[PDB]
Amino acid sequence: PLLAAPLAVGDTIGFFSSSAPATVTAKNRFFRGVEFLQRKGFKLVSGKLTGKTDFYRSGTIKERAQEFNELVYNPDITCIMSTIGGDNSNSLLPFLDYDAIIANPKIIIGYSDTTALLAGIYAKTGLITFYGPALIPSFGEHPPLVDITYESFIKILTRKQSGIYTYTLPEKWSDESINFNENKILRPKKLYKNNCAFYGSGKVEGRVIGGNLNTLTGIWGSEWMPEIRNGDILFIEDSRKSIATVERLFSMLKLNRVFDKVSAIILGKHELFDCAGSKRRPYEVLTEVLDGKQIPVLDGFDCSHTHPMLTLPLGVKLAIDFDNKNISITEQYLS
Amino acid sequence: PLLAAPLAVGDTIGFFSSSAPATVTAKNRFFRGVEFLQRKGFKLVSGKLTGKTDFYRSGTIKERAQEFNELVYNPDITCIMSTIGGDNSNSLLPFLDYDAIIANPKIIIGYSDTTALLAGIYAKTGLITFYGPALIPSFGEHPPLVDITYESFIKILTRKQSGIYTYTLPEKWSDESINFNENKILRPKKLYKNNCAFYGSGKVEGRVIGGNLNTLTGIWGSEWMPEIRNGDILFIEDSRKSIATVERLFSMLKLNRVFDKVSAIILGKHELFDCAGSKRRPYEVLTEVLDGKQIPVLDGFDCSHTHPMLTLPLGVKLAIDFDNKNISITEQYLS
Ligand SMILES: Nc1ncnc2c1ncn2[C@@H]1O[C@H](COP(=O)(O)O)[C@@H](O)[C@H]1O
Ligand SMILES: Nc1ncnc2c1ncn2[C@@H]1O[C@H](COP(=O)(O)O)[C@@H](O)[C@H]1O
Numbered sequence A, B: 001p002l003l004a005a006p007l008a009v010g011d012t013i014g015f016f017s018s019s020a021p022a023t024v025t026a027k028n029r030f031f032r033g034v035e036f037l038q039r040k041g042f043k044l045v046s047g048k049l050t051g052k053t054d055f056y057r058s059g060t061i062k063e064r065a066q067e068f069n070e071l072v073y074n075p076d077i078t079c080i081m082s083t084i085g086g087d088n089s090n091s092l093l094p095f096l097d098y099d100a101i102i103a104n105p106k107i108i109i110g111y112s113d114t115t116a117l118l119a120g121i122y123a124k125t126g127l128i129t130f131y132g133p134a135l136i137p138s139f140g141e142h143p144p145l146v147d148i149t150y151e152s153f154i155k156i157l158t159r160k161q162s163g164i165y166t167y168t169l170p171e172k173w174s175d176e177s178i179n180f181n182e183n184k185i186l187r188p189k190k191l192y193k194n195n196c197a198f199y200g201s202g203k204v205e206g207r208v209i210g211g212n213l214n215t216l217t218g219i220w221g222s223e224w225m226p227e228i229r230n231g232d233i234l235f236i237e238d239s240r241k242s243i244a245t246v247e248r249l250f251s252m253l254k255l256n257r258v259f260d261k262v263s264a265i266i267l268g269k270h271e272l273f274d275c276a277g278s279k280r281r282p283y284e285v286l287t288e289v290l291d292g293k294q295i296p297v298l299d300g301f302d303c304s305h306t307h308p309m310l311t312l313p314l315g316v317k318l319a320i321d322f323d324n325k326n327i328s329i330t331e332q333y334l335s
Helices: A027-039 A061-073 A089-095 A098-103 A112-125 A135-139 A145-158 A243-255 A282-290 B027-039 B061-072 B089-095 B098-103 B112-125 B135-139 B145-158 B243-255 B282-290
Strands: A012-016 A043-046 A077-082 A107-110 A129-131 A197-199 A203-212 A233-237 A264-268 A297-301 A312-314 A317-321 A326-329 B012-016 B043-046 B077-082 B107-110 B129-131 B197-199 B203-212 B233-237 B264-268 B297-301 B312-314 B317-321 B326-329
Touching: A012 A061, A027 A043, A027 A135, A061 A077, A061 A089, A061 A098, A089 A112, A089 B243, A098 A112, A107 A112, A112 A129, A112 A203, A112 A312, A135 A145, A203 A264, A203 A312, A243 A282, A243 B089, A264 A282, A282 A297, B012 B061, B027 B043, B027 B135, B061 B077, B061 B089, B061 B098, B089 B112, B098 B112, B107 B112, B112 B129, B112 B203, B112 B312, B135 B145, B203 B264, B203 B312, B243 B282, B264 B282, B282 B297
Parallel strands: A012 A043, A012 A077, A077 A107, A107 A129, A203 A233, A233 A264, A264 A297, B012 B043, B012 B077, B077 B107, B107 B129, B203 B233, B233 B264, B264 B297
Antiparallel strands: A129 A312, A197 A297, A203 A317, A317 A326, B129 B312, B197 B297, B203 B317, B317 B326
16 A cells, blocks of 8 residues: 555644635634644644635635645645535545655545545555544544544554554543534533444454445545455444435445445444434444345444544554454554 | 337326335325326326335335335236335335336336436336326426426327427426425415526437436446446436535536536436525536536426426437427337
8 A cells, every 4th residue: 555654743734625615614613623733733734725715615626626736745744634524525536636646645634525535545546544533623622522532643643553553442422513613612512421332243354445425425436436345344434314315325335235345344423313213223224224144343433423533544454353342453554 | 128018098007105205294295196197097006105104214125125016016007106206215226126127017207216216227127217207296286387297297108109209398387395295275386487508509319318316326336327328418407405415416427437428418407406605506517517528418407306397218319409499309218
């Protein structure tokens, strides 16, 4: 695989808005995120579409591609971070400078709609990119949850590449939709005990592939969708979806023979899942779709739209130990 | 192509609910549709899931496949008609009796989510299926618009298969979200002059392929997605979507090289399109995505979620005359 250099405290992080113009619509939270990372000692470079709006997006398809490419050209930048997702990053894919990425590999990180870029870049270049924090939703989060998000971010990206890395399990989590763009909080978010479940036995090791499943539909079938292979571990998360949408997306995977290939599935915690009164969880829907076929599932991994959020390299081997109830990175993912 | 027997006055129509349980949730409109077709002289066979609910759907994946298959097995049925769409018909595809569909070809008709079945059946069998009326939303519509929908339905499906068929243009249309399941109406829908536009010159003839674009994402990449070939006319429609979603879906097509293949695009009128205050129409978004690629477009064809709705065979040749501003079926589509 193509590997970027590790992050270090004091490095320059560049940020871009490939979809929703949240540097404007969520300016307070944006500023909180900027201040948070600056206090940690990081230098921040703002992408050229910061503070701009084109209604539902930050700018034209071509301008958004340019914003990203300009960060790739900047030799001072070690990490390229999404400000926020949205719906429209897939539009950029024909216009990204993949050859420049090959020449100057960097840490590329984000989630949700940014999946189109993470997966697309991996498909074109083999660069190991990261499912992880975006500046506004992740680092604009209030304490204490933001601290746990940062702890994972810094551990994953700065640690020495020796031996396996076994993930810590967040003690508490939340998906409550309060205190987003408000400067002062009325009360802290409702905290839930971690209900992550390991369905299966033994150990499964394989290349992790995926991201935000709804977003993957925007690149599916194209040269920008990485091929899923026999033995892969499928990582998928979604946010604020109806059970109807979740069934459709799971069946899409089934039709595409994905469940014939993968040796395990990781489901990220689904933020504010709408079960339509059925009281069914996404795992139950997956079980029906699988039609009697047994695939080991890690249900409720803290790498999604819920807080706190862990950082996960995509395109490298993970080992899920279903007996010991843990998950580890087993392949080198930074140079 | 595999062709079904033509419809005739007095024939038996079977209906199925492959997704949303609207025979229950829209019972008034359902009964209106039933009574409408019965007054036209049609005999109706109720699918086994009529009157049933499983929260967001009519029944389990296998129950819904069974409901559909049972209509295929019935020798008295000439037309199999969707009650309504939803989100979940793609789930049925591994379980449909394709051999029986080939042995007993019938008119299969519906729209929206039912695209998954229409396109999937075509991919597997070569049967010419129909983008057209569903029992509840289409035939439960109040006069005057339901009569125009019916006129197209009966003309397309009963006419002699000799010479080209040139579509009529509805004088008025509506997408107003009133008078759906109410038994009594306070006033009629607002009616709009037909603003259909032909962008381009000359005449384009090619096989029509597509349906509901959002729905196609659920079968994309699989053996159930019909291959789009050089020279095809792409037919796409969506309903109640944001401009953000529309950009994502158009870019999905671009990434898949669809715009390198197709000779023309038909955009169905978009029901209650949400432009996010941009005042932009879907054609403008398509124009940006096309990035200079000159493809002639019929913008606003009345085969979508708007009323009235025309009936369109999928998988046969159409001719769009951009100079004379008309559209015709040029290939035999029923036996
Ligand atoms: N106005 C808002 N109020 C509460 N949460 C929001 C708001 N806007 C965005 N979010 C959260 O930010 C995430 C959306 O970011 P993305 O998935 O990148 O589009 C979701 O997890 C939402 O819960
Ligand atoms: N409660 C409702 N009020 C108004 N229109 C509806 C309602 N439910 C469904 N529809 C319409 O029914 C049509 C068919 O739905 P679908 O088959 O899900 O695309 C769409 O054009 C919807 O706008």
